[PDB]
Design a protein around this ligand. Structure first.
Ligand code: SF4
Ligand code: F3S
Length: 106
């Protein structure tokens, strides 16, 4: 599985969903997650993220390990997203800010 980590929060560019062959992104108010059962690990999404927030599960930084289980839990509750949409309004003010998990919305 590929994992969305911290920098997606409050950026949510959605560029990643275009390239996904299996449509395994689920949508929340200010973050996207990849559903781990569904991902086929084709890695096509991780060059597409402008926030460079996607990682192979096995490459998630040490300090972002929480995101692996978080993607798995929220994918079960959040709706499937299959079409790109516009980035959140202030997405590049927040792009690159560390510690955005305190801002996540369910
Ligand atoms: S690695 Fe592939 S299947 Fe997995 S979310 Fe990314 S683009 Fe979709
Ligand atoms: S910011 Fe998020 S919505 Fe996709 S393109 Fe990057 S993982």
């Amino acid at each position: 599985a590929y994992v969305v980590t911290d920098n997606c929060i409050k950026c949510k560019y959605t560029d990643c969903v275009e390239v996904c062959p299996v449509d395994c992104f689920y949508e929340g108010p200010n973050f996207l997650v990849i559903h781990p059962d569904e991902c086929i690990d084709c890695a096509l999404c991780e060059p597409e993220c402008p926030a460079q927030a996607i990682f192979s599960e096995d490459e998630v930084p040490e300090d972002m390990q929480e995101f692996i289980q978080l993607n798995a839990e929220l994918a079960e509750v959040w709706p499937n997203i299959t079409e790109k949409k516009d980035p959140l309004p202030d997405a590049e003010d927040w792009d690159g800010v560390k510690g955005k998990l305190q801002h996540l919305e369910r």
